[PDB]
Amino acid sequence: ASLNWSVIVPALVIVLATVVWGIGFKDSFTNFASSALSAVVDNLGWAFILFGTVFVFFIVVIAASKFGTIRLGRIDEAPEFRTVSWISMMFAAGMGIGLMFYGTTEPLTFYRNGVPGHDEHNVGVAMSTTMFHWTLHPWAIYAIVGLAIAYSTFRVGRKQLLSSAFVPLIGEKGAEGWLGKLIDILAIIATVFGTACSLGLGALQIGAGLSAANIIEDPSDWTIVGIVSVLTLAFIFSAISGVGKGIQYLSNANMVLAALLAIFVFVVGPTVSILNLLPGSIGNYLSNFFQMAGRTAMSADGTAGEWLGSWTIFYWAWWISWSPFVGMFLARISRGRSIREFILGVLLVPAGVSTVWFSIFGGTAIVFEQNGESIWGDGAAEEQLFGLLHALPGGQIMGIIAMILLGTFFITSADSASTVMGTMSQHGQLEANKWVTAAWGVATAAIGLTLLLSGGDNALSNLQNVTIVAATPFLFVVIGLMFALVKDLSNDVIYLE
Amino acid sequence: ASLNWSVIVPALVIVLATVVWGIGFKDSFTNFASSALSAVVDNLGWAFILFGTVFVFFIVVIAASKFGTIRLGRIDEAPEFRTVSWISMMFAAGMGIGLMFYGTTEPLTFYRNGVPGHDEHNVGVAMSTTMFHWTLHPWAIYAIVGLAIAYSTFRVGRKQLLSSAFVPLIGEKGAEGWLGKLIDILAIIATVFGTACSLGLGALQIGAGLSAANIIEDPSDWTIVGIVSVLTLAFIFSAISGVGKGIQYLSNANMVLAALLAIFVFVVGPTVSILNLLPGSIGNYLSNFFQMAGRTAMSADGTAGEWLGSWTIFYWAWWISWSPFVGMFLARISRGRSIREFILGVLLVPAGVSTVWFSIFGGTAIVFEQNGESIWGDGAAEEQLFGLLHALPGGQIMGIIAMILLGTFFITSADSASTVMGTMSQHGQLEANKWVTAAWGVATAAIGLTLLLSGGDNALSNLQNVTIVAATPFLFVVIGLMFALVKDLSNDVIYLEYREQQRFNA
Amino acid sequence: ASLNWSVIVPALVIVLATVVWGIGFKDSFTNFASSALSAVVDNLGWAFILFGTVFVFFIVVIAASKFGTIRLGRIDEAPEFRTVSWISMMFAAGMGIGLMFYGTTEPLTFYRNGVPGHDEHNVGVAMSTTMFHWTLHPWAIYAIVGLAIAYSTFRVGRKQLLSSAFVPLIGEKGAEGWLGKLIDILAIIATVFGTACSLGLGALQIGAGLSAANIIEDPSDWTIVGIVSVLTLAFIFSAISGVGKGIQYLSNANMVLAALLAIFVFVVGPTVSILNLLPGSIGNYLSNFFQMAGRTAMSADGTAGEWLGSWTIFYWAWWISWSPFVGMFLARISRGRSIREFILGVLLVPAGVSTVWFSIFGGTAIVFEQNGESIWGDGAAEEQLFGLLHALPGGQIMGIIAMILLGTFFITSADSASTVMGTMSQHGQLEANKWVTAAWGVATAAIGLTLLLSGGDNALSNLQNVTIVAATPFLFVVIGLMFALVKDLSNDVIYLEYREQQRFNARLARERRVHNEHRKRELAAKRRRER
C-alpha cells in the first residue's frame, strides 16, 4: 500500500482537531470562526475579489491563444468519450446541493433586501447577482485547477497530483519535497471543508423537509445526527463499491429526480415568467458583470463589507476550497480534449444549467413575492424550497422527492470527494483504496456534522464562516497555479513548432 | 411565366380573407387583433427577446469565423460593384417611411414618459433605447436572411427562394414538398403584412401632414383611402413601365428629398445639440446594450410588459416580417462579397444613417421640450414631424416636401417589395412578371388600408397588433435558418479545405 | 543640422505675444481666454468627446491587426533596451505633476460633489470617472503619435518630425512645404502650452505647499514668481551642463521620492481600504466606460456642459497638446519593438501607475470624508495633498519631499519638453542645440507664469481655458494622423508581401479544388450509366 503519510498525517490531524474543538468546546470554536472570518474578509477580501475576476480573464485568454489548439494527452489524440457524454457529464457537474439550497433562497433574498448599490425589489439585479455567483466565476476556477492537472497528467505524463502541476515552478524536486507535499495537504483539507460544507447544508436542509412534511415535529441535534449517520453509513457501504448500485447510477437518478423537480415547478408554476427570466438573467448578467466585479467593502459608501462576507466572499472561498475535487474530476473526463474545447465546455455548459435552475426556483419564489403570496415564511433558508413546493398542486409529494434527491446527492458527492481525496493521499494513484476513500468520507461527514452542532441556531452562519477560513491558504495555490500553468504551456512541444 | 399557383393561392387567400374580415366586420376583426396580440406578447415575447439578441450574437460570430473568408459566389469570385457603390445602396436602404414616422416621435416619447427601468427626462436613455430598435438588432436579422439567400443562390446555384435555404435540413425532396412550400408562403405573407404596415404608417402620416399644411380640415376616412388609392395607381404606372426605371429613379428623389429634410433641420435646428448626440447616442447605446437586451415582462418589478408590447416586441416582429424582402435585396447587391465583409457592411452602414437621422429629428424634438417649447401637441405620432417642422423658419414649405417624400417612399417601397413577392411566387425567377408584381402591390396597399380603417381612432394600435400577430409564425423560420445556414457553411468546400489543412499539418 | 527659422520664428512670436497679452493686459487676456473657452467647448466639445474614444478604438484595432507584427525599425532589428528597462521608463513616464496635483483632489472632488448624472458620495463613480481621464484615453493619443513618429523615423527612415508622419497624405514635398512646417509650428505651440499647464500646476501646488508647512505666509505673486524663477534658473543650469545626463539621475530621485510618498501614505493610511479600491477601480472603470464616453453637454438633461469644460474636455485638450512631446519621447525609447508590443505597453503600463496612485491618495482622501475627518479646507485643489499628508504621522516631513518632487518634476518636465521642441525646431535633429533648448524652456515657463498671473484668484480656470484653446488646432492634427498612419502601414513592404501571399494562395487553392472537381464529374460519369 502506497500511502504518503507525510501528507496524510498533518491532514488528518487538522481534521480531527477541528472536530474535537467543535463538538467539545462549542462556544470556543464558534467564536474562533467568527473572528477569523472578520480577519480574512477585512484583510484578504480584496484578493478573493480581484483575483476571482482575474481567473476569468486569464482562462478565456488561454483559450483564445495558441495553447488552445494543444490537446490533453498524446499529440493529436482523440477524445476518450464522445462529445455527447462529455457534455452530459458536465451536467451532473452543475447540479448539486448548493443549487438545492440556494436555488430558491438566493434570488428571493436579493429581491427582498436589495443588493449593495441598488434598491430592493429589482428582478434583474437579483437574477444577475445570482448568475454572477454560480456561472463564469466558479467554473473559471474549476477550469484552472482542472487544466493544470489534465496537462501535468495526460500531456506531460506526471502524477495526478496538485503538486505535480507546480513542477514548472517548484522543480521536479519541489513536488517531492515538503512544499509539494504541503500543496497536497492544503488540497485535501480544502476538499474536506469544501465538501463538508456541502454535506452540512444537505443535512440541514433535509431535516427541514422532514418538518415541512410532518414526518417530524421540529428537528433537533439528534435528528441531524440521525440524518448524517444514515447518509454517512449509506456512504460507507456504497463507498466499498458493489455491482448493482454504483456511483454512476446515482448520478442518473440524481438527474431524473432533479429533472422531475425542475419540470414540475416549471410547468405547474408561472411558466412564461420563468421563460422571461432566461433572457432576463443573461442580459442583466452581462450588463452588470463589471459593476459586480468592482464591488468591495468600499462600495455603497463603505457599507457593502458585511453583505459581501455573507454572499460573494463566501462563494469564492467555497469555490476555491472545492477546486481540487472538481478540477481533478474535470481532468479525468477530458483526456484527448483540446485546451480551447475544454475551457469553452467548462464555462458554458454548467452555466446553462444554473441559469435554467435559478430561473425556475428563483423565478417562482419572486413571482410569489410579487403576487403577495410570499414563500419567505420566517426567513430560514433551509425551509424556503419546501415553502415553494407546498404552494403548488401536488407540491406535497414533490417535497418528499426533494428530500431524496438531497440524500442521494449527499452520498453521490461523498463518494466523488473521498475518491479524489484518496488519490491525493496515495502519490496520485488512479483507482484509490476503498478503505481510505471511506475513511476520508467519514471525517468529511464528521466535520460537516460538527459545523452544524457547534453553530446551533447559527449553523448556516457557522458553516460558511469556517469554509472561508479553510479556503484562504489554498487561494494562493490557485493563484500560483496560473504561473505554473503558463510556464508548462510554454515549454510544450507543438507550441515550440 | 412559370407561376407557382400552389404558393400564390394560399398566400392570396389569407390576404383577401383578411381584407374582407377587417373591412367587413371591423369589430370582429379588431377584437381578434387585440386578443391574439395578447396571447403572442404574453406567451412568446420571451422568444422575440431571447432570439432577437441571439441573432446579433450569431451573425457576429459567423463573421468572426473561418466561414467569413468564403465568398458569395464561385471560389475566389469578386464583387460586381465598387464597395462605395455597395455602401451607397445600403445607405439608401436605411431610409424609408419608418424613419420618417418614428424619427421625431420615438426618442421624444421615451424622453417625456421615461422608459421602464429609468427616470423620465433622460436623454441618454431616450437615444440608446432608440438605437436599440433601429441598428444592430434589425440588421442582424436582415443579414441572417440575406446570407442564407445569397449563399444559396450564388454559392450553390439553388433557386433564389427562401425554402432553398432550408435544403441542408429538409433535403431536396422536402424543399419541393409541403414544408418547403409552407416556408415560401409564410415568407410572402410576412412580406405583405410587414410592408402594408409601412404603407399604412405612410398613409396615416401624410394625411396628418395635409392638415398641418392646412389643405384639409381633418384626416377623415374618405381621405386616407384617397391617399392610398392615388399612390397605389402611381405604383401601377411605375410597375408596368418597367420596375427598374422607377426604383432607381425614385430612389434619387428619395435621397435628394431626404437629404434636404435632414440638412434643413440640422442647419436651422439646434446644430450643436444634434452634434453632441452623435457620440451621445453611440456611447449610451453601447453602455445600455445588454441591459436593454435583458428587459422583459418580468423587468421593472413585473410591470414592463405593456411597454414592450407597444415598442420592442412590435419592432422585432416588424423587422422579422420584413426580412425576406430586405434580405433578398441585400443578396442581389452583394454577390462576390466575402461573408465577413458582407456582415460588417450590413450592420454598420445603415446604423450610421439611423444614428444620424434620430440625432437630428429626435435630438431637436428633445431640445424643444427642454426649452419650454414642446412640440408634442395632442400626442399623436403622425402630427409630430409636422409639429417640429412648423416650429422652424421655412418649415411650412418643408412640411410639403416631407409629404412628397412620404409619397415617393410609399411607391419605391411597394415597387421593391412587390418585385421580391413576384420572385417568391415564380419559382425564384429574378425578373418578375409586371402583372404578378402589380398584383401584390394592390393586395398589399389594400391590407395596409384595411388595417388603418378597421382600427378607427386607434389605427396605429391596430396596425401594430396585426403585424405582430402575422410576423409570429415567421420568427420560427428565421430561427431554423440559423441551423440551416450553419449546416450549409459546414459543407462548403473552401472551409472544409481549411479544417482539412488544419487536420494534416496539426 | 541647421535651425529651421521658418518654423522657429512664427512659434516664438505666438508665444511671446501671449506672454505680453497676459502680463500686459490681464483684463484683455482673461476675457478673450474666457470667451474663446465658451466658443470651443460649445462648438467643438462634441469632437473632443467623439474622437477621444475613437482614438481608443483605432489604436486597439491597429494592435490587433496584422500591422502589429511590423517592427519599428529594420526587419528583425533587436530593441536597444531590454524588455525590463523599457517598461520601467514607461512607469516613470506615467508619473507627473498631474498625478501629484490631481491625485488627491480629483476623486475627492467627485466623491464630495458627485458628477453629472449621479449623486454625491458614490465611491465607484468617483474612482471610475478618474480612471477615464487618466488611463486609456490619454495614452491612446500618445500611442498614436508615438507610433506615427516611430514608424516614420525608424522604419521608413524619415526626419524625426511630425510633418514627416503626413508624408503619405501630403507628400515629401508637402512636408518640406508650408503645411508641413505649419504642422511642426502647431506641434511646438501645442507643446509649450501643454508643458506650461503642467508648470503652472506645479507652481500653484509647490506654492500652497510652502504655506502648508508654515514656512511662508506672504501669499502673493512675488512668491509664485520666486518659484518659477529659481526652478527656471535650475532648468537653465541643467540644460547647460547636459540635458542627457540630468534627465537620468534627476529622474531616479523623482521615483524614489514618488515611491516614498506613495508607500508612506499606503502604509500609514487606510491600507486595506486602498487595496479594496484596486479591483474597485478597474471594475467600475470597465463598467462605466461607454456611459462616460457618451457624456456630452446634452447629458443630465442638457446640463453636463459646465462640468464637462472643467474636467473631461480640459483633460482631452491637455493630452492632445502634450502629445507631440510624449509621443516623441515614446518613439525614441521604443525602437526595435513590434507595433503591437508598443501599443500594449503604452496603454497597459501607465494605467498601472495611475490606478495605484489614485487608489492610495484619492482613496485615503475619501476614507477621511467617510470618517468625518474631512480634508478639503477651503475647497482648493492646490492645498489638498498637503492637507491629506498632514493628517498623517509624518505629514510634515513627507509634506516636504512633496515640495522637492514638484520642483524636481518641474525641471525634468521642462528639460524633456524643451528637448523635443529643439529637435522639432532643427529638422528632426536628435541631440539639439543648447541655447535653443533653454530658449523654449524659458518661454514655456513664461507662459505658465503668465497664465497664473492674468488668472488672479482664479488662476486654474485661466490656466485651463488657455490650455484648451491652444490645443484645439492640434486635435485635427491627431485626427489626421489616423489617416496618415493607415496609409503608411498599408504600404509597408512586409504587409504588402503578406497580402500578396494571401492572393496567390487563394488562387493556388482554387486551381487544386476546381480541377479535382472536374475529375470527379468524369469518374462519376464512368461508374454510373457507363460502367
Ligand SMILES: CCCCCCCCCCCCCCCCCC(=O)O[C@@H](COC(=O)CCCCCCCCCCCCCCC)COP(=O)(O)OC[C@H](O)CO
Ligand atoms: C463580459 C464577460 C467577460 C468576458 C471577458 C473576456 C474579455 C477578455 C478577452 C481578451 C482576449 C485577448 C486576446 C487573446 C489572445 C492573447 C494571446 C497571448 O497574448 O498569450 C500570451 C500569454 O498571456 C498570459 O498568459 C498572461 C495574460 C493572462 C490574463 C491576465 C488578465 C489580467 C486581468 C486583470 C484585469 C483585466 C485587464 C488586464 C488584462 C491584461 C503570450 O505570452 P508569452 O508567450 O509572451 O509568454 C512567455 C512566457 O513568459 C515564457 O515563460
Ligand SMILES: CCCCCCCCCCCCCCCCCC(=O)O[C@@H](COC(=O)CCCCCCCCCCCCCCC)COP(=O)(O)OC[C@H](O)CO
Ligand atoms: C450564440 C451563437 C452560436 C453560434 C454557433 C456558430 C457555430 C460555428 C462556430 C465555429 C465552428 C468552427 C470552429 C473552427 C472554425 C472557426 C474558428 C477558427 O478556427 O478561427 C480561429 C480564429 O478566430 C479569431 O480570430 C477570433 C479571435 C477573437 C477571440 C476573442 C476571445 C473572446 C473574447 C470575447 C470578447 C473579446 C473582446 C476584446 C476586444 C473588445 C478561432 O480560434 P482562436 O481565435 O481561439 O485562435 C486564434 C488563432 O486563429 C489560432 O490560435
Ligand SMILES: CCCCCCCCCCCCCCCCCC(=O)O[C@@H](COC(=O)CCCCCCCCCCCCCCC)COP(=O)(O)OC[C@H](O)CO
Ligand atoms: C464595441 C464592442 C466591444 C466589445 C465587442 C467587440 C466585438 C467582438 C469582436 C470579437 C471578434 C474579434 C476577432 C479578432 C481576431 C483578430 C485575429 C487577427 O487577425 O490578428 C492576430 C491576433 O491578434 C492578437 O494577437 C491579439 C491582438 C492584441 C491583443 C488585443 C488588443 C489589445 C487589447 C488590450 C486591452 C485593451 C482593451 C481592453 C478591453 C476591451 C492573429 O492571431 P494570432 O494567430 O497571431 O494569435 C496568436 C496569439 O497572439 C498568441 O497565441
Ligand SMILES: CCCCCCCCCCCCCCCCCC(=O)O[C@@H](COC(=O)CCCCCCCCCCCCCCC)COP(=O)(O)OC[C@H](O)CO
Ligand atoms: C475599444 C474597444 C476595443 C475595440 C473593439 C474591438 C476591436 C476588434 C478588432 C478585431 C481585429 C480587426 C483586424 C482589422 C483587419 C486588419 C487586417 C487583418 O489582419 O485582417 C484580419 C481581420 O479579420 C477579422 O478578424 C474580422 C473580425 C470581425 C469582427 C467583427 C466585429 C463587428 C462589430 C460590429 C459592432 C457594431 C456596433 C454598432 C455601433 C458601433 C483577417 O484575419 P482573421 O482575424 O479574420 O483570421 C481569423 C481566422 O484565422 C479566420 O477567420
Ligand SMILES: CCCCCCCCCCCCCCCCCC(=O)O[C@@H](COC(=O)CCCCCCCCCCCCCCC)COP(=O)(O)OC[C@H](O)CO
Ligand atoms: C439621405 C440621408 C439622410 C441622413 C442624414 C444624411 C445627411 C447628409 C446627406 C448626404 C447623402 C446621404 C446619402 C444619400 C444616398 C447616397 C448619396 C451618395 O453618396 O451619392 C449618390 C448620388 O446621390 C444623388 O444623386 C442624390 C442624393 C445626393 C446627395 C449626395 C450627393 C450630394 C452632391 C452635392 C453635395 C453638396 C455639398 C458637397 C459639394 C462637394 C450615389 O452615387 P453613385 O453614382 O455612386 O450611386 C450609384 C447608385 O446606384 C445610385 O442609385
Ligand SMILES: CCCCCCCCCCCCCCCCCC(=O)O[C@@H](COC(=O)CCCCCCCCCCCCCCC)COP(=O)(O)OC[C@H](O)CO
Ligand atoms: C450631414 C448631417 C450631419 C452629419 C455630420 C455632419 C457634420 C459636418 C461638419 C460640421 C462641423 C461644424 C463645426 C462648428 C459648429 C457649426 C455650428 C455653429 O458654429 O454654431 C451654430 C449656432 O451658432 C450659435 O448659436 C452661436 C455660436 C457662437 C460661436 C462663436 C464662435 C466664434 C467665436 C470667436 C472666437 C473664436 C476663437 C477661436 C480661436 C481658435 C451656427 O450654425 P448656423 O448659423 O448654420 O445655424 C444657426 C442655428 O442652427 C439656426 O439659426
Ligand SMILES: CCCCCCCCCCCCCCCCCC(=O)O[C@@H](COC(=O)CCCCCCCCCCCCCCC)COP(=O)(O)OC[C@H](O)CO
Ligand atoms: C459607418 C458609416 C459610414 C460608412 C463608412 C465605411 C465603413 C463601413 C463599411 C465597412 C465595410 C468593410 C468592413 C471590413 C471588411 C473586412 C472583412 C474581410 O474581407 O476580411 C478580410 C480581412 O482583411 C482585410 O481585408 C483588412 C482590410 C484591408 C486594409 C486593413 C485596414 C485596417 C485599418 C483598421 C482601422 C479601423 C479603425 C476603426 C476603429 C473604430 C480578409 O478577407 P478579404 O475579402 O479582405 O480578402 C482580401 C482580398 O479581398 C482578397 O482575398
Ligand SMILES: CCCCCCCCCCCCCCCCCC(=O)O[C@@H](COC(=O)CCCCCCCCCCCCCCC)COP(=O)(O)OC[C@H](O)CO
Ligand atoms: C442557442 C444557440 C443556437 C445557435 C445556432 C445553431 C448553431 C449551429 C449548430 C451546428 C449545426 C446546426 C445545423 C445541424 C444540426 C444537426 C446536425 C446536422 O447536421 O443536421 C442533420 C442531422 O440533424 C439531427 O440529427 C437532429 C437535428 C434536428 C434538425 C435541425 C432542427 C432545427 C431546429 C429548428 C427549430 C424550429 C422550432 C420550430 C417549432 C415549431 C439534419 O439532417 P437529418 O435528415 O438527419 O434531419 C435531422 C433529424 O433526423 C430530424 O428529426
Ligand SMILES: OC[C@H]1O[C@H](O[C@H]2[C@H](O)[C@@H](O)[C@H](OCCCCCC3CCCCC3)O[C@@H]2CO)[C@H](O)[C@@H](O)[C@@H]1O
Ligand atoms: O431527401 C429528403 C429527406 O427528407 C427527410 O426529412 C424530412 C423529415 O421529416 C425530417 O428529417 C425533416 O426535418 C428535420 C429538421 C426539421 C426542420 C424544419 C424547419 C422548417 C422551417 C421552420 C423551422 C424548422 O423534415 C423533412 C420533411 O418532413 C429525411 O431527411 C429523409 O427521409 C429524406 O431523404
Ligand SMILES: [Cl-]
Ligand atoms: Cl497537440
Ligand SMILES: [Cl-]
Ligand atoms: Cl471562396
Ligand SMILES: [Cl-]
Ligand atoms: Cl443622459
Ligand SMILES: [Cl-]
Ligand atoms: Cl429589472
Ligand SMILES: [Cl-]
Ligand atoms: Cl460604488
